[PDB]
Paper text:
This binding promiscuity makes the yjdF riboswitch stand out among riboswitches, as most typically recognize their ligands with high selectivity. In this work, we use antibody-assisted RNA crystallography to determine crystal structures of yjdF riboswitch from [name] in complex with chelerythrine and proflavine.
The crystals diffracted to 2.77 Å and 3.05 Å resolution for chelerythrine and proflavine, respectively. Our structures show that both the chelerythrine- and proflavine-bound yjdF riboswitch adopt the same global architecture (RMSD 1.528 Å). The ligand-binding pocket, which is the same in chelerythrine- and proflavine-bound structures (RMSD 1.129 Å), resides inside the central core of the yjdF aptamer domain. Nevertheless, the data preclude unambiguous determination of the ligand orientation in the pocket. Possibly the observed electron density results from a mixture of different proflavine orientations around its longer axis, consistent with low selectivity of the binding pocket. The structures explain the ligand binding promiscuity that distinguishes the yjdF riboswitch aptamer from other riboswitches. Both ligands bind primarily via stacking interactions that confer high affinity but low selectivity.
Numbering used by the authors:
A (entry chain L): 1 to 215
B (entry chain H): 4 to 228
The structure:
Amino acid sequence: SDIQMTQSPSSLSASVGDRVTITCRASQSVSSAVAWYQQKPGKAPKLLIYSASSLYSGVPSRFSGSRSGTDFTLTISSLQPEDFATYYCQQSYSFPNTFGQGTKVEIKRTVAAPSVFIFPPSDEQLKSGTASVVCLLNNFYPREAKVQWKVDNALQSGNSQESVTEQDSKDSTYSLSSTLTLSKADYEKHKVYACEVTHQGLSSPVTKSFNRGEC
Amino acid sequence: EVQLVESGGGLVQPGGSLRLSCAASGFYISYSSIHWVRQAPGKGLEWVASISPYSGSTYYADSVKGRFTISADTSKNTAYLQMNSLRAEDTAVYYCARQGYRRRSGRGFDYWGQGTLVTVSSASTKGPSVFPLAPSSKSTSGGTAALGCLVKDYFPEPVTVSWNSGALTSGVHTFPAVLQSSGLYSLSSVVTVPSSSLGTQTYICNVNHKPSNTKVDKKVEPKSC
RNA sequence: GGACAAAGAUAAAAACACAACGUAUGGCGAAACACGUCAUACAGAUCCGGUAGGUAGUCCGGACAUAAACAGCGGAGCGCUGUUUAUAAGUAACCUUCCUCCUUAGGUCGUCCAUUCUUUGUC
Ligand SMILES: Nc1ccc2cc3ccc(N)cc3nc2c1
Ligand SMILES: [Mg+2]
Ligand SMILES: [Mg+2]
Ligand SMILES: [Mg+2]
């Protein structure tokens, strides 16, 4: 039977100087054969802790590791701006090796309302034979937001794809784009298209809409 | 001084074979365990395979058992991962890692490569079709409007987007590409500009897709009335 | 006094040779497994009877314990249970008694200790 490593929490929000703890629970004994790593987006992981308590050469002291039974914790005594990354735990007691699902450490910030814009399909795209309508939610925090597309005030499901940016270096906010892809004919069968955003910063749903064939 | 460089990734069709290499420098692979770990785009690390020192013992994960072979060539100081009968789920960045000395670093992986991308897909290289996202015809909210381009139906990655030939770099968000049901990628790049400039200033996005040899400059302007 | 006899108490006591693979755990070797090396442990010298009175780590016989092979049971592999076999060569070799034409053998009888003192019966 393979060993499972369950990492909690999947995502954590904290500020510079915070003490952070991430835990990993093993389905069976793994003794002390546990390691932790830090992967910054687009970069290879870097070894942080080995043998589940030992600090790897050259790693900052603030990072520590503790073992209680089959539970292992990684602790940063005081966060620094360079310490915001995804963190992984790994067991190496028995093959096959297994990794934790990861924990992303993000900057904590003021609740920020999204600025919402709606872009109608371009004429070149309708000449190409497809229609895409793009909603943009700009500079908002936290990353938890919802977009409800409405064609002629009719809710649409399964035709919308979303994409979110990594937290900004300066504003520490996330931006989201939602794209609704409809057939050119279907885009030409409906007169009203709206984007409804429900976010914590938004006291009420904020909707930005256009009509088919209007300026 | 210690370095690992993976190579040999790329795009392969489902059911096809690929062979990854991990060239080492600053150490001899015979005295260490070598591991291959893959990371699917937007997903976590997944251990793939390992080779032990002085025995050649090979260990694999269930997801790859029977289809992957890990080997080592000491004279070329290089590890290898042979993948046969590949499928879309194998698409990932593959790192090779050195396992550290047990006395110094336990069983942790102390050095990794930059990774190499493996894309399993039947899609053919397509040049991106860049469309224009017009700034709001109505007055913008906040006094700054948003104008963007849509780089849609391009394979494979990556694309590069500049604005005004790179003169406009502040406030631009290029979104991560999303794979659509077609198997082709799509993304959008948007910029916020002062609304006073929308009629006075012309905004162009420059999209480059080197794999297809595609350079496009698309002008985004407000629409009629 | 001495002799024979029985019954007691006491003491004694087996030659030569006794091997060689390997397994497990842990440490170390640039070392999760394999490999090499070192340390430690295991690798029937348990119990009983007999062997014309006695002496067995090695006999003969049996039991038990432990290991291997085979059979059965439960959820190919894995774990147990039951049976068989094994646990040196060797009670081989030499010497020796008897028997058998397995006779250039096979079996079998021996190889060691049995001292000292006490009581009684009859000469
Ligand atoms: N070599 C031998 C031969 C026969 C033996 C017979 C014995 C009978 C009883 C005992 N206690 C020890 C014995 N030892 C013997 C040693
Ligand atoms: Mg006896
Ligand atoms: Mg003796
Ligand atoms: Mg015998």
